Amino acid sequence: MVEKFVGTWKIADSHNFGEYLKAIGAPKELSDGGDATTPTLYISQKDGDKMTVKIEAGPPTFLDTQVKFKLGEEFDEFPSDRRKGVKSVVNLVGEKLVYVQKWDGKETTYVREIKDGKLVVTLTMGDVVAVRSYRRATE
């Protein structure tokens, strides 16, 4: 189930991602150009239940990172966008993956799936919604 996410991905499309980042209160300097950012993801999994994801943030800041979690187990995150007290939990909803972050009383959601070969993520903060899609690297 998670297996279909594993691999290396490069951005292909980005939609309203700068306004999304602006919507979660991310700094202007970090929100500006958000759809021009080219992250590379390195996704792996273990026992069908734990996942690891290394991100190479790429130009210009190279805020490279990694997250490790278990499906269901809430964990603490320290996001590029500079928020605090962030608790995140990831769970399978059917064949989609659902990622929820909570901080400062607030809630944002990330829904990721596979769509004609592309890893597609819909980001939701309120009714501010962004979409980005990744194609296999480099194939």
Ligand SMILES: C=CC1=C(C)/C(=C/c2[nH]c(Cc3[nH]c(/C=C4\NC(=O)C(C)=C4C=C)c(C)c3CCC(=O)O)c(CCC(=O)O)c2C)NC1=O
């Ligand atoms: C299969 C599951 C899956 C997971 C778990 C996954 C996680 C994931 N995807 C991204 C890209 C990444 N980066 C950012 C934010 C930024 N990007 C920039 O260049 C800058 C400056 C910012 C900060 C303002 C977000 C919101 C995301 C998540 C959206 C995405 O996956 O593309 C991150 C880094 C977010 C951060 O550094 O705080 C993580 C942990 N991607 C997947 O496909």
